[PDB]
Design a protein around this ligand. Structure first.
Ligand SMILES: [Zn+2]
Ligand SMILES: [Zn+2]
Lengths: 814, 115, 62
RNA sequence: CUACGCAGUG
RNA sequence: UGCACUGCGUAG
């Protein structure tokens, strides 16, 4: 039968299942089960859980037991195993010591350690000078890293004498530096990890070192009390008056960071106001049982509850549609989009979803190789730092955030700060960390689901600084055509056809897939967000130094990753994830999507047997992938180039910030050479801590039909000017709901309706070529309603109700 | 320019008002106790806030956390001063009970002072 | 159809209720919002009519 | 090209 | 009452 083995030799290499006192199952089996998870085949995981009293068989009778969102209690079950894992780690260290004492040089593999922690392998061990033994633990520890956080192995470290039974350790409330504790934990657990570990990322040599140190800090921080982390503040004298001002920050990932320009003007006033130190100090203590998140303070005497008003209904358009034969009984086209009202507890409830963000430790070698590969997808673009006068702001009448929203909009602050002041603030952010407060606001929009949606309005200072830092690269990406990232590419004037042709480019046996990210903005691991930030900042090689880039990363983390959240007059500490109001929201998520795809491909290739592979080139590629993953430190540029070319040839991706359309080879995916939907599910399981349902994922066998859905648009192949082209059309229900229901009564009727219905007709024209007659009739209904509105209002306006104007919008002339 | 001066004045006034709302008796204690002088922000309200506000979603959390007129939280004793509902009405202690729980506009906001 | 116009009637009833300062009372607003959301998401006509009748009774009470 | 307003997408 | 992209309408 099949057991998981991590093998390396000339003939074959990889971590996969093979046909080949001691316990029935080994640690490699557990790692494989938790890293290659398929609900259809969970026999090994179920037997391991049952045998060691993690849970009972009845637990598996319940459906969706594996899902974290549907069944969070699973997190408890896995935790029941964590202690065992911890023990194994300790034993591993002992084993290593013995080898060092015995002058033994060898490689330790997960498949040679039983679940009781005992090591039963004495092969590949070569005698050397006593005291000179140097074991290799890269593969073992790297593969075991993801399991440690999922099972919460180090929980015992939070108890006195590292015993779960005995009480918790009562750390000093004022203590914030745990550097010695981090060193002690690393020495006890990862003693033989030869790579240097820096608890404080301020002393990291490069971006890869920062990723390594942050990965270790993620695991080490779970032990320390939550109150210790956060902004560090001091009481100082300014102008003969006392002020409490932030002078540092404690990051769960980056350790302790101290501002370099601490001392005891408009720039200073904004720095103080944006700082949550004063607000928290002047705020009353708060205990909110409505959420599991940390509560800091309350700035208001009374709590505030916000409600979502119901949508307005347009009787003229609904009556017109009814008279023309729509909304009948049994009709295919129906109203499924509405404005869903919410109670006063909705907003906070939405914040509660941040509970799905969990401390996740990534496979550091895998993450390093994946980031190196991902950097290739962003090589064409150019980036750097720009001055204040080179910054473009689309809208100056937007909210400036808290507390800046009280006094005015973003225009007020942009006008108040001169270019020199903005440059001074940016330079200050290159030397110091400025914590900020982000407000949570309910968004009023159409949806087909009753769930409320929240957006994070960040402070003005963070937006300004991130703009000056990133706008060059962001504009470079948006102006590029034919790349994997398709931000800035219009679907009109043949853009959809161009993108689809680009995706299909040179695939031997093409099929299409598309997947979804459950709770993407909330459940995203902090490590992946840091990796995306580093990828975006890697364009600053010349214009910024190592210290400047690190301080910019720290500012982003303190303003995006674990900032202070303002909700209904109360302050909370965001566990993690990504804010939707960031200057780099779309692009960071695109980087995350590319990283997940590359990780899935890497897992698929290594999980293959290798011996069965009948292609010499693919076997050599797998062997070199394992070499560059678990055996070689320095980045191999040649192999990175080769793997990027391989992925581009057999894995063509079109990514827009959450949505991915992938063209992949039939035979390679069937043989496991290329990632499939199951690989993405496993990756999202052991990395993103979320279960991906096959219902939300789609696979298209035939290219002529096109992608099932992309950006809420479906695709049709239609005949235009003797040439067949791909044309995007929306769901008729969405357009009809937009027409019938409106945000406010101001846009209920009048001239302003003409523009709205013209835009809706522009969007809905492609439905005319759909085989269904009602879909086509939707566009004619919209045109006739535009005619009727013009008549009620009463030559150029003719073009609005003549279909040639909408014909022109989808032709490749422009 | 004039609006810039207005914003500067508003920010200064807000900071000084928060200072008036700030008390140094315990802040100086914690500052002097700390060797480095740096303290986490989150702990400042915990050990220095005179007033505590607790949000109660249901009666079960009510009995669990602050059932009586005096309760213990954050290693401190808090005595209740007021209990309002979601509608900002003065709910009395007697009214809070299992029998009358359905008639209360949850969540309940309870405000207490440090003992 | 009766389902679509029932949904539209529920939407307008919730709008007028909100304009009647019903949102001042937390529990009444919660009940009205729940009823309206269920009506919009309802797939059975009879349940939609029952919920619309309940919401109309809420309005008629005041 | 710029100012304002609107619609769609994540 | 957030960050971006795209397309329209009105003045220059
Ligand atoms: Zn480092
Ligand atoms: Zn730079």
């Amino acid at each position: 039968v099949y057991r998981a083995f991590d093998i390396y030799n000339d003939k074959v290499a990889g971590f996969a299942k093979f046909l080949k006192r001691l316990t029935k199952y080994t640690m490699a089996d557990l790692v494989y089960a938790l890293r290659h998870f398929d609900e259809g085949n969970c026999d090994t995981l179920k037997e391991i859980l049952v045998t060691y009293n993690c849970c009972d068989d009845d637990y598996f009778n319940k459906k969706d037991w594996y899902d974290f969102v549907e069944n969070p209690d699973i997190l408890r079950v896995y935790a029941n195993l964590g202690e065992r894992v911890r023990q194994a780690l300790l034993k591993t260290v002992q084993f290593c010591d013995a080898m060092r004492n015995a002058g033994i040089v060898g490689v330790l593999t997960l498949d040679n350690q039983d679940l009781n922690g005992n090591w039963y392998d004495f092969g590949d061990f070569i005698q050397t000078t006593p005291g000179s033994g140097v074991p290799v633990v890269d593969s073992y520890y790297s593969l075991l890293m993801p399991i440690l956080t999922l099972t919460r192995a180090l929980t015992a470290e939070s108890h006195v004498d590292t015993d779960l039974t005995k009480p918790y350790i009562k750390w000093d409330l004022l203590k914030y530096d745990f550097t010695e504790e981090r060193l002690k934990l690393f020495d006890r657990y990862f003693k033989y990890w030869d790579q240097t570990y820096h608890p404080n990322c301020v002393n990291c040599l490069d971006d890869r070192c920062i990723l390594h140190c942050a990965n270790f800090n993620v695991l080490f921080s779970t032990v320390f009390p939550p109150t210790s982390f956060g902004p560090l503040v001091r009481k100082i004298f300014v102008d003969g008056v006392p002020f409490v001002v932030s002078t540092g920050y404690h990051f769960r990932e980056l350790g302790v960071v101290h501002n370099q320009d601490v001392n005891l003007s408009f720039k200073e006033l904004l720095v103080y106001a944006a700082d949550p130190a004063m607000h928290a100090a002047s705020g009353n203590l708060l205990l909110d049982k409505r959420t599991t998140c940390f509560s800091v303070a309350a700035l208001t005497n009374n709590v505030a509850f916000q409600t979502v008003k119901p949508g307005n209904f347009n009787k003229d358009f609904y009556d017109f549609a009814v008279s023309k034969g729509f909304f009948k009984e049994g009709s295919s086209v129906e109203l499924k989009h509405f404005f869903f009202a919410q109670d006063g507890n909705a907003a906070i409830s939405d914040y509660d979803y941040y509970r799905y963000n969990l401390p996740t430790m990534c496979d550091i070698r895998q993450l390093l190789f994946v980031v190196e590969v991902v950097d290739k997808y962003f090589d064409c673009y150019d980036g750097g730092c720009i001055n204040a006068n080179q910054v473009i702001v689309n809208n100056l009448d937007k909210s400036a955030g808290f507390p800046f929203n009280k006094w005015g909009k973003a225009r007020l602050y942009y006008d108040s700060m001169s270019y020199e002041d903005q440059d001074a603030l940016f330079a200050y952010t290159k030397r110091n960390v400025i914590p900020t407060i982000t407000q949570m606001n309910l968004k009023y929009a159409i949806s087909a689901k009753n769930r409320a949606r929240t957006v994070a309005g960040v402070s003005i200072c963070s937006t300004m600084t991130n703009r000056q830092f990133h706008q060059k690269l962001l504009k470079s990406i948006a102006a590029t055509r034919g790349a994997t990232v398709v931000i800035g590419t219009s679907k009109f004037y043949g853009g959809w056809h161009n993108m689809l042709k680009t995706v299909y480019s040179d695939v031997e046996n093409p099929h299409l897939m598309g997947w979804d990210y459950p709770k993407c903005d909330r459940a995203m691991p902090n490590m992946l967000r840091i990796m995306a930030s580093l990828v975006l900042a890697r364009k600053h090689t010349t214009c910024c130094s190592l210290s400047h880039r690190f301080y910019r990363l720290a500012n982003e983390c303190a303003q995006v990753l674990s900032e202070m959240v303002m909700c209904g007059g109360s302050l909370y500490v965001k566990p993690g994830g990504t804010s939707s109001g960031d200057a780099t929201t779309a692009y960071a998520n695109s980087v995350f999507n590319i990283c997940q795809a590359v990780t899935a491909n890497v897992n698929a290739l290594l999980s293959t047997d290798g011996n069965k592979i009948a292609d010499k080139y693919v076997r050599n590629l797998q062997h070199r992938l394992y070499e560059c993953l678990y055996r070689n430190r320095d980045v191999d540029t040649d192999f990175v180039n080769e793997f990027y070319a391989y992925l581009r040839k057999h894995f063509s991706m079109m990514i827009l910030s959450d949505d991915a359309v992938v063209c992949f080879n039939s035979t390679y995916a069937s043989q496991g050479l290329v990632a499939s939907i199951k690989n993405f599910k496993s990756v999202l399981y052991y990395q993103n801590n979320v279960f991906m349902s096959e219902a939300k994922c789609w696979t298209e066998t035939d290219l002529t039909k096109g992608p099932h859905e992309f950006c809420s648009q479906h695709t049709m192949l239609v005949k235009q000017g003797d040439d067949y082209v791909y044309l995007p059309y929306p769901d008729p229900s969405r357009i009809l709901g937009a027409g019938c229901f409106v945000d406010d009564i101001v846009k209920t009727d009048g001239t302003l309706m003409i523009e709205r219905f013209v835009s809706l007709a522009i969007d809905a024209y492609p439905l005319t070529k759909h085989p269904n007659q009602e879909y086509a009739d939707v566009f004619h209904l919209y045109l006739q309603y535009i005619r009727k509105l013009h008549d009620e209002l009463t030559d150029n306006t003719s073009r609005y109700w003549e279909p040639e104007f909408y014909e022109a919008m989808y032709t490749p002339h422009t | 320019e004039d609006k810039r001066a207005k914003v500067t004045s508003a920010m200064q006034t807000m900071l000084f008002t928060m200072l008036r709302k700030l008390d140094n008796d315990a802040l100086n204690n914690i500052i002097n106790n700390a060797r480095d002088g740096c303290v986490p922000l989150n702990i400042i309200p915990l050990t220095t806030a005179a007033k505590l506000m607790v949000v109660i979603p249901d009666y079960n959390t009510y009995k669990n956390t602050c059932d009586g007129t005096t309760f213990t939280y954050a290693s401190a004793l808090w005595e209740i001063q007021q209990v309002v509902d979601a509608d900002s009405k003065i709910v009395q202690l007697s009214e809070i009970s299992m029998d009358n729980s359905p008639n209360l506009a949850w969540p309940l906001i309870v405000t207490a002072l440090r003992a | 159809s009766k389902m679509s116009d029932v949904k539209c009637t529920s939407v307008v009833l919730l709008s007028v209720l909100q304009q009647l300062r019903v949102e001042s009372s937390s529990k009444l607003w919660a009940q009205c919002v729940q009823l309206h959301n269920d009506i919009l998401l309802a797939k059975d006509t009879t349940e939609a009519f029952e919920k619309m009748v309940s919401l109309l009774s809420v309005l008629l009470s005041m």
